[PDB]
Design a protein around this ligand. Structure first.
Ligand code: GLC
Ligand code: GLC
Ligand code: GLC
Ligand code: GLC
Ligand code: GLC
Ligand code: CA
Ligand code: CA
Ligand code: CA
Ligand code: MG
Length: 487
């Protein structure tokens, strides 16, 4: 039990990190120190230290040789073990005077920790004059991403999350979203597992970013509504945000970050940047305070013509490492208005006279079927109008009209308006005799009483009198919330 040995583990700035936390890809150093050799010691013929480096610890031959003057460094890549042998020069010093005790020099293993949520344990062995050895104490350090970490109570999985909500805070993931509506996306910068992190300066300078890969074909950003707040409800000011249509069209700096994180957007994307890496680090990262980003995005009007699916996903890049969030999907309903020409004013009757020549002075009806708003939608109905621009040369608006439910409508109070029910009393009409047009509008009140889980569809009949012999056409435009749909 002669020279006691002692291993120490420090980060790239020499801070003792034993039993603490450090970022993935962080440089971790091993100091294999030994106590001063006593007086009466035999000449030291051999001084060997053997370190079986831990799993997932990448050895850096170059740096350790540089950081281990006085020792010949050898490495067994096969067993990931490194060996240090005191040079001839170094030994002479251990023998300069045996009658006295002499302090020693120590080797330093330099390398990086490569895995998330892993524990890296370490000890080394000292053998002197191939006669006796001492196994050293074990030291350790963990990386973020490991729940139930007895050393870092706040540690857990690194996982950003994304969620879609409507204006009233209701979660609308997977639901149908009317064209023109807004997606109030809530992104979470998952920072809690970083609490009490002891990473070095180089590591903290690899920056902090948050990316949102948004469907640029279906949505357009409303970056003016972007809002960033932390877990404590306070506004965040150190984060700037920008967007690019595609990697190539982005600042070389951004391409490099996204590249080293293994993140490759599908086209255009929104990226958030921490302006002062250090300030951000001391304020939110090592304090474990999660950030909340709200990035509203509106569904382009053309989506309502074609219909279709659009999905959203985010990423967060901490200390240069990237992590992806869950994917949120929504689909847009294809609002398809239709008009028919009928002699009856009964929702029941399916007979029409489409394409049939109508006799002079015939009182008929234009059946204006509104677009269908599918069940399980995301926002309330605030506008549902039928607009008809008839040809005054051929048709004279009679002055009468009726409106009917085309599907079973459900109210927020549970009442089910059975399909085919007259609903005229919830509408109003403003006619422009001059130009030859008419507009039937539902009362906003009534529309907002319909449950958002309910399907909705109406149709109206506008009585017309044929004042001239001939074939005339008409434009019927159905308006649903903030978008108009023709035909
Ligand atoms: O676990 C041991 C291994 O850890 C890492 O995977 C390193 O890439 C490799 O060099 C080393 O041998
Ligand atoms: O790792 C070898 C030995 O190193 C130190 O002496 C520790 O105190 C002891 O508990 C351990 O068995
Ligand atoms: O360093 C904190 C440590 O406190 C106690 O010693 C626990 O036994 C150990 O599991 C924990 O990691
Ligand atoms: O290159 C090492 C690691 O760096 C970052 O963590 C990247 O996000 C990851 O994909 C990569 O494996
Ligand atoms: O290395 C990248 C990955 O690391 C972790 O598994 C994260 O939970 C995951 O979201 C991320 O994509
Ligand atoms: Ca976490
Ligand atoms: Ca995109
Ligand atoms: Ca007209
Ligand atoms: Mg600790």
């Amino acid at each position: 039990v002669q020279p006691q040995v002692n291993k120490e583990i420090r980060n790239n700035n020499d801070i003792n990190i034993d039993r603490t936390l450090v970022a993935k890809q962080s440089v971790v150093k091993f100091q294999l120190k030994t106590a001063d050799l006593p007086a009466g010691r035999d000449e030291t013929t051999s001084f060997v230290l053997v370190d079986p480096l831990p799993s997932g610890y990448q050895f850096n031959p170059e740096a350790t040789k540089a950081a281990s003057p006085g020792f010949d460094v050898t490495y067994d890549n096969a067993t990931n073990t490194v060996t240090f042998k005191a040079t001839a020069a170094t030994l002479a010093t251990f023998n300069a005077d045996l009658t006295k005790s002499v302090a020693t020099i120590y080797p330093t293993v330099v390398g990086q920790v490569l895995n998330d949520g892993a524990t890296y344990k370490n000890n080394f062995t000292l053998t002197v004059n191939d006669a006796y050895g001492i196994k050293s104490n074990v030291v350790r350090v963990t990386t973020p991403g490991k729940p139930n970490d007895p050393d870092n109570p706040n540690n857990n999985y690194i996982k950003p999350t994304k969620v879609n909500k409507n204006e009233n805070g209701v979660v609308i993931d997977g639901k149908t979203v009317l064209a023109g509506s807004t997606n109030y996306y809530e992104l979470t910068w998952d920072l809690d597992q970083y609490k009490n992190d002891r990473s070095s300066a180089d590591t903290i300078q690899k920056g902090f970013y948050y990316v949102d890969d948004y469907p640029e074909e279906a949505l357009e950003l409303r970056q003016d509504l972007v809002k960033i707040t932390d877990a404590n409800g306070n506004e965040v000011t150190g984060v700037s945000v920008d967007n690019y249509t595609n990697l190539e069209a982005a600042p070389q700096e951004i391409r490099d970050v996204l590249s080293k994180a293994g993140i490759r957007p599908k086209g255009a994307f929104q990226i958030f940047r921490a302006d002062n890496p250090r300030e951000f680090y001391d304020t939110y990262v090592k304090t474990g305070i999660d950030l909340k980003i709200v990035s509203p995005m509106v569904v382009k009007k053309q989506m309502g013509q074609t219909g279709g699916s659009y999905e959203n996903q985010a990423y967060q890049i901490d200390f240069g490492n990237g992590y992806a969030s869950n994917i949120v999907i929504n689909n847009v309903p294809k609002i398809n208005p239709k008009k028919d020409v009928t002699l009856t004013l009964d929702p029941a009757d399916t007979n029409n006279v489409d394409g049939q020549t109508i006799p002079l002075n015939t009182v008929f009806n234009y059946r204006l079927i509104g677009g269908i708003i599918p069940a399980n939608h995301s926002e309330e109905l605030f506008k549902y109008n039928f607009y008809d621009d008839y040809d005054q040369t051929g048709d004279h608006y009679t002055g009468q009209y009726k409106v009917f439910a085309k599907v079973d409508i459900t109210l927020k109070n549970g009442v089910i308006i059975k399909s085919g029910t007259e609903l005229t009393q919830y509408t109003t009409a403003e006619v422009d005799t001059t130009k030859g047009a008419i507009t039937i509008k539902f009362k906003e009140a009534f529309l907002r009483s319909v449950s958002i889980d309910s399907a909705f569809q109406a149709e109206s009949y506008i009585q017309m009198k044929r004042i001239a012999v001939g074939t005339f056409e008409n434009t019927y435009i159905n308006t649903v919330n903030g978008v108009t749909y023709s035909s």
